[PDB]
């Protein structure tokens, strides 16, 4: 079994911890955790390409995209590998997270270990925003907090 | 060619940025970068097993030690994989790190991507202190700053 963990923080009040679990090579990855300090509602949630936070979140690069595809939702076949959709904050700004994904991995070609998890300012539109950016970025806006995904026990 | 980067933050005055470069699977990792806010002199400089910073640097675990050896210097024959030795700070509290190591790696069984780099409070005795502690951590003391090692462009 593989485990991973990520501590997210940024320039403001958003912070949280995300755990990844993957029973075997060909199993889905389960994320779970909590993020606090968010505006109420939905926020984009992506694995970005680099585990480089020398410039805070901006140095993480684009969404993790080995196959040079377009941005989509987690349920689309046409998606960046990093496209995990949205995460949902309550009225008190708390986002419990619980997600299963079979495209990211903790080993092999789609390994996200050593890369960066980012929570975003705006909802990810899942490729349906009808402008150029939706296709790149889901229009999710600024990177509110991030962390390098590391190996967990 | 492989590249990696690590931003070291702590709860105290110590911070830094470390860059890693390996030319191919067989070759040494070259480390450069800088750390500031240190007391003048030597400090343990180790890659610990887990990239987990949920409770600060302490949740990173012990030194990366796949082969279950006791602690040593990088040049000793019995050493942990994560055993990089000492890093030296000048009178102004700056360590201009430059290190070449052929035991760590940016891929494979000795891969340190997704693990935690820690700069320690005291000098590493290189496993020769003749006490229990020497044998594990080199009597390097507390964890001054740390970061998960991440994939870089
Ligand atoms: Zn995307
Ligand atoms: Zn050691």
Swiss-Prot record, chains A, B:
Lipid attachment site numbers (S-palmitoyl cysteine): 6
Residues annotated for Cu cation binding in this entry: 46, 48, 63
Catalytic activity, as annotated: 2 superoxide + 2 H(+) = H2O2 + O2
Residues with the N-acetylalanine modification: 1
Positions annotated to bind Zn(2+): 63, 71, 80
Compartment list: Cytoplasm; Nucleus
Domain of life of the organism encoding this protein: Eukaryota
Record-level GO cellular component terms: axon cytoplasm; cytoplasm; cytoplasmic vesicle; cytosol; dendrite cytoplasm; dense core granule; extracellular space; lysosome
The record's account of how the chain is modified after translation: Palmitoylation helps nuclear targeting and decreases catalytic activity. Succinylation, adjacent to copper catalytic site, probably inhibits activity. Desuccinylation by SIRT5 enhances activity.
EC code: 1.15.1.1
Cofactor note: Binds 1 copper ion per subunit.
Swiss-Prot/TrEMBL keywords: Acetylation, Antioxidant, Copper, Cytoplasm, Disulfide bond, Lipoprotein, Metal-binding, Nucleus, Oxidoreductase, Palmitate, Phosphoprotein, Zinc
Enzyme's top EC category: oxidoreductase
Note: A mouse model of ALS overexpressing human SOD1 variant 'Ala-94' exhibits disease onset at 89 days (males) and 99 days (females). There is a marked suppression of DAO expression and activity in the reticulospinal tract of the spinal cord, but not in the kidney or cerebellum; transgenic mice accumulate D-serine, but not D-alanine or D-aspartate, in their spinal cord. Simultaneous presence of the amyotrophic lateral sclerosis-associated human DAO variant 'Trp-188' potentiates the development of disease.
Subunit relationships: Homodimer; non-disulfide-linked. Heterodimer with SOD1. The heterodimer CCS:SOD1 interacts with SLC31A1; this heterotrimer is Cu(1+)-mediated and its maintenance is regulated through SOD1 activation.
UniProt similarity note: Belongs to the Cu-Zn superoxide dismutase family.
Protein's recorded name: Superoxide dismutase [Cu-Zn]
Gene name as annotated: Sod1
Full-length numbering of the shown residues: 2 to 81 of 154
């Amino acid at each position: 079994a593989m485990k991973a963990v990520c501590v997210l923080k940024g320039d403001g009040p958003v912070q949280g911890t995300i755990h990844f679990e993957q029973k075997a090579s060909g199993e889905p990855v389960v994320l779970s955790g909590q993020i606090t300090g968010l505006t109420e509602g939905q926020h984009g949630f992506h694995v970005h390409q680099y585990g480089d936070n020398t410039q805070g979140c901006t140095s993480a690069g684009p969404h993790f995209n080995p196959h040079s595809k377009k941005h989509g939702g987690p349920a689309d076949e046409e998606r960046h590998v990093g496209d995990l959709g949205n995460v949902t904050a309550d009225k008190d700004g708390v986002a419990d997270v619980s997600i299963e994904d079979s495209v990211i991995s903790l080993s092999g070609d789609h390994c996200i270990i050593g890369r960066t998890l980012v929570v975003h300012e705006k909802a990810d539109d899942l490729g349906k925003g009808g402008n150029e950016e939706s296709t790149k970025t889901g229009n999710a806006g600024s990177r509110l907090a991030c962390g390098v995904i590391g190996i967990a026990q």
